[PDB]
Design a protein around this ligand. Structure first.
Ligand SMILES: CCc1ccc([C@H]2C[C@@H](C(F)(F)F)n3ncc(C(=O)NCc4ccc5c(c4)OCO5)c3N2)cc1
Ligand SMILES: CCc1ccc([C@H]2C[C@@H](C(F)(F)F)n3ncc(C(=O)NCc4ccc5c(c4)OCO5)c3N2)cc1
Ligand SMILES: CCc1ccc([C@H]2C[C@@H](C(F)(F)F)n3ncc(C(=O)NCc4ccc5c(c4)OCO5)c3N2)cc1
Lengths: 244, 244, 244
């Protein structure tokens, strides 16, 4: 009910379909993507393309209304496991902005074809929040350590031009471009692709948070600044953080 | 009988001399390269330039009509060991294409001066094969993870301009260019260079394969798809891989 | 006495004020720096800008006239610990060349805004010296492994232009630019920044040197070539290294 699924030749295209919220994730959306990724190759498909409907790829996470929001973080982890564990290459057609949870998602794709007006952002420094280590490690691997510092420490937007520069984007193109490419890849030797993907993903980025990292994480998440940042956002005013 | 070794100033130039197979590696050539790396600086030389004769640096591996062809994987590991252990900086003059084993050898150099019309490639995904972890890790560090994903998951070529971009190439230039640069390096303090090499090479790229990596590596190498890739090539036709 | 410290808005600007020596790091300047960083946030400041007076950011370590040389490394280390431990983002306003220790100090900043005439260099291979692992890892993460090899193995200069390209420079700008950016960062949630800073700094660059690394490190440092570099410099001539 919240995603689209079409197959052409050997390419499964999975389309996020919640444009009314710029494809922000929730319990139901996340759980359907998961079933969809798991059930691909069932199936003569040999490559997956992932994309958003409308103007965004995925603008983050919106749990308003969501009855199982408590379950969301767990379902989200399952979704990333499901992708990571997939023997099928996932080609992200990043049709528009990919922010926060959406950025994580885009980064969990195996390759990325980015629309010219797309951008990537972790606005965590604006919301007093904190990321898991993987998000940071993978981000670093894709934009270089230096830019990752700017992105995490100052909510810097990574434009499409620069994503291509750093390697975040493999290509600047459209959904069609990404489907063409996915079809080439569908004709390649699956086991070779299975191997490379497993090793690539095992580059270290999947890291358990050090003891001090969990501290700072929890401290950030339980802070009053977290509440201040939301009220500010809602009021369309600058936030006045207290560092607590 | 299969390579050329000349020395000028304090620069040893080792040339692969099998242009009739585009300098494709085999038992003998690997053995002779190993010897030449070790016997280097015996000898007053403080720097090595490694290059290929003809249009290509090294197009892959051959073995066709190769008497001691079974201990070739072994002799190739010896070569990489020798190069990694040489107290001498090795400047690769990548005069042309560097593919598969050729790309490995190119990466095992300490510096790279790339000709405009050279490209690098791991076509393992087109042939149903799997690489060793180091090939993957070093590649990632030289082209960036993002671009490494494209080269490995879809057999994408790395052109010279892009090599310069990411740092795979330090310079775009000729053999002569590389040799002149090597002469400068020959006048720097050996012990400084020797320390830096060891540490740089010890960045973790030299990684034992995880269980899952050995398993997938082995499935691929013993797969039917490997035969299918070759017979399809021999029949000048699209391969139809089973994933097995 | 040796650094200037001002605060505007919520930004602490610390200026290295030894331009007569191109801001090279002497035992005392190091301590004053260390103290200034620790004592920051004491303090309504939420961000630090670290810059140099005159034409150079920092031309390296001093030691000339130092009656207590042996203690110098421990002070330089202390300074890095202080920066690494600071909950405050340090934006380096790299107003000119950052060489050796200068480059280390620039790399321990959290973000770098670089002047168009500036450049970064480890001329260690010109002096028979060797670096600690962190300098090597962090450098590789900032300019890419390929360019890290060139810089370390041949003393290659990283221009502002290419620092921007690789991520070593987040921006090309003036001190004032760096200060405007810092002011912004100062209005972001500190706890978010503190977390990302810790995790980022814990990417592995902070590495205990391996047995072989110490061995080579000591070997270079204790070498005769180290003296020869100093002598040739003074005698205004090309060094003549021996590898011992
Ligand atoms: C196995 C493949 C894989 C699995 C999960 C991830 C990421 C995904 C990503 C998200 F779901 F948000 F997108 N994500 N988010 C949270 C986690 C995650 O790993 N959470 C567990 C956790 C517990 C305590 C912590 C902590 C993390 O950080 C500091 O203290 C986590 N892990 C990334 C890759
Ligand atoms: C110590 C310096 C050094 C030594 C060797 C290498 C690479 C070279 C590169 C090549 F020889 F092909 F060029 N290469 N190829 C194979 C190996 C290699 O290390 N092979 C052993 C091995 C056994 C089982 C495996 C496995 C690897 O991968 C998954 O399952 C290997 N090691 C790279 C660096
Ligand atoms: C915890 C944050 C942090 C602390 C220190 C460093 C760097 C700084 C950098 C400098 F101070 F020069 F700028 N630096 N210099 C020396 C050290 C340093 O760590 N020295 C200890 C050491 C002992 C024996 C060794 C060895 C290192 O390398 C090979 O053999 C060292 N550590 C880098 C990051």
């Amino acid at each position: 009910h919240m995603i689209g699924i079409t197959q052409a030749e050997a390419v499964l295209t999975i389309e996020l379909q919640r444009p009314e919220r710029r494809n922000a994730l929730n319990s139901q959306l996340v759980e359907e993507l998961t079933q969809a990724i798991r059930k691909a190759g069932d199936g003569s498909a040999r490559a997956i393309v992932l994309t958003g409907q409308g103007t965004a790829f995925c603008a983050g996470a919106d749990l308003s209304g969501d009855a199982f929001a408590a379950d969301y973080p767990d379902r989200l982890i399952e979704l990333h496991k499901a992708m990571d564990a997939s023997p099928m290459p996932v080609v992200g057609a990043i049709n528009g902005p990919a922010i926060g949870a959406g950025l994580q998602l885009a980064m969990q794709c195996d390759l990325r074809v980015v629309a010219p007006d797309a951008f990537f952002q972790f606005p965590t420094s604006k919301y007093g929040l904190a990321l898991d280590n993987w998000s940071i490690r993978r981000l670093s691997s894709l934009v270089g350590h230096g830019r990752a510092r700017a992105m995490l420490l100052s909510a810097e937007k990574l434009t499409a031009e620069i994503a291509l520069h750093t390697g975040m984007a493999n290509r600047i193109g459209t959904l069609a471009d990404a489907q063409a490419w996915a079809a080439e890849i569908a004709r390649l030797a699956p086991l070779a692709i299975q191997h490379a993907k497993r090793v690539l993903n095992d580059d270290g980025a999947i890291e358990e948070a050090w003891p001090a990292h969990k501290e700072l994480f929890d401290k950030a998440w339980g802070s009053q600044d977290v509440i201040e940042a939301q009220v500010a956002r809602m009021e369309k005013r600058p936030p006045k953080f207290q560092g607590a």
